[PDB]
Amino acid sequence: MKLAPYILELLTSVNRTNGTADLLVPLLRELAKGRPVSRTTLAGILDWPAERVAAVLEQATSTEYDKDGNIIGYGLTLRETSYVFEIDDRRLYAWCALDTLIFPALIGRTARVSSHCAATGAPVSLTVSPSEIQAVEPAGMAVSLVLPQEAADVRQSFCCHVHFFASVPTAEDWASKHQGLEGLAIVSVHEAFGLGQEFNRHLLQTMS
Ligand SMILES: [Hg+2]
């Protein structure tokens, strides 16, 4: 219920240098176009030397690149995951369930999100807009949260534990067999979306 520790630690894990948020939003908007993103493209959008783009990305250890050295994944990714994230006619993916709830507001576009329950395999889907969620299927969908670690790779420490589930009772049953994960908690997808909204508010307030 109390979500401050999650917001605080995720902000710390995500915002590791000056300009991270400045870079992250344009990057997500470019990735949402469905093609690899070159550093020079970001440099142009930001009015930064490409050097600076590189230094910000270097601190982002989980960043995925393709065989050309272009960016293909940073929260939103072109590389298949369990979380499908579609913007119009482009199929993208996300690193975790919470990412799917956060990115639409940051990109300014509505996403069709689909996945499978981590406990039962049942398909789950919803439509996520910058301001609300809709067509939640099934209606009682839930999300797992853990406390992000500050100095760890965000995918290894946070993303891999943050799933969708068919329902709260199903997720709580799953959670009962998952001890030793700091801050493990089950919330409804609505509660998770509200967490995402608070995270975004704090993130955006740190932009130039
Ligand atoms: Hg994530």
From Swiss-Prot:
Keyword annotations: Lyase, Mercuric resistance, Mercury, Plasmid
Keyword Lyase assigned: yes
Domain of life, source organism: Bacteria
BP-aspect Gene Ontology terms: response to mercury ion
The keyword Nuclease belongs to this UniProt entry's keyword annotation: no
Reaction equations catalysed: an alkylmercury + H(+) = an alkane + Hg(2+)
Cross-referenced InterPro entries: MerB (IPR004927), MerB_HTH_dom (IPR024259), MerB_lyase_sf (IPR053717), WH_DNA-bd_sf (IPR036390)
Stored HAMAP family: MerB
Function in brief: Cleaves the carbon-mercury bond of organomercurials such as phenylmercuric acetate. One product is Hg(2+), which is subsequently detoxified by the mercuric reductase.
Protein's name in the database: Alkylmercury lyase
Natural source organism: Escherichia coli
Gene name of the record: merB
